[PDB]
A = this chain, B = another copy of it.
């Protein structure tokens, strides 16, 4: 069924190139070469996690020799109230090693051992705020002992957590401020969105002012909302037998927010 094939596609996710994503990638590349600690802070739904995923794919692990694959970048997202056994477990699994039964001290060395050999140029710890304060000692140890940069990406609240510990605050001072869209950048993003993200049989012309003012009021510059508003409107429109998104559909969806 054509309709179901398009809905199964639309409900899915993809990465769209944006000025903000390229900016982060070039910035992280500098910190990687210099091995310097830094921070990534911005508002929710601005597309910070997605840009980090894209970076991991930009430079993939290289395995041209018999030895363990050389993984230049490690990306992890700690669970809630993450303790020191959990941080080490997740780093080790990411690099494809199995963790054996033992205590924190027992595989701490193993984490170091697995960290060595593989390149591990940079460690990106998304959602840094969700971590027990005691674990920031093991993060500093890694950053200090090994030639590894620790990006530590987080939301605005993270700064409230970082400032509670002098030694952490004075080691992660450099920061990039991820932001939201406004002005022409938003209009160009909507034009990009229609053509690449949407494969609808008939064009919706979402760049038009009459509907762009609606997308602007509904979105407020958050790339996460633009994705929801247009992705749901496309499925709701096709489900009615339409070949494009009607102004009435954009209004009907916007009213739910």
The residues of A with any CB-CB pair to B shorter than 8 Å are: 7, 11, 20, 23-24, 27, 30, 33-36, 38, 43-45, 63, 66-69, 79-81, 84, 86, 96-98, 100, 102, 105, 108, 117, 130, 134-135, 137-138, 141, 147, 155-157, 159-160, 166-167, 169-171, 173-177, 179-180, 222, 224-225, 228, 231-232, 235-236, 239, 255-257
Contacts and interface: CB of A to CB of B under 8 A. Distances in A.
Given A98-B155, A173-B257, A176-B256, 13 more contacts: A11-B34, A23-B66, A63-B179, A67-B177, A67-B256, A69-B179, A80-B84, A80-B134, A80-B135, A96-B179, A96-B180, A155-B167, A156-B166
* 6 cross-chain pairs, A with B, having the tightest CB-CB distances, nearest first: A80-B137, A98-B156, A23-B66, A100-B160, A44-B170, A68-B177
A35 B235 CA distance: 11
A228 to B, nearest CB: 7
Contacts of A239: 33
A135 to B, nearest CB: 8
Given A96-B180, A100-B157, A232-B36, A105 B134 contact: no
Copy tally for this chain in the complex stands at 4
A173 to B, nearest CB: 5
A100 B41 CA distance: 14
Given A33-B7, A155-B167, A156-B97, A257 B79 contact: no
A54 to B, nearest CB: 16
Given A80-B84, A105-B79, A239-B33, A166 B175 contact: no
A166 B157 contact: yes
Contacts of A105: 79, 86
B7 A43 contact: no
B97 A79 contact: no
A231 to B, nearest CB: 7
A66 B177 contact: yes
Contacts of A256: 38, 67, 174-176
A175 B239 CA distance: 21
Contacts of A35: 11
Contacts of A69: 179
A11 B149 CA distance: 12
A100 B34 contact: no
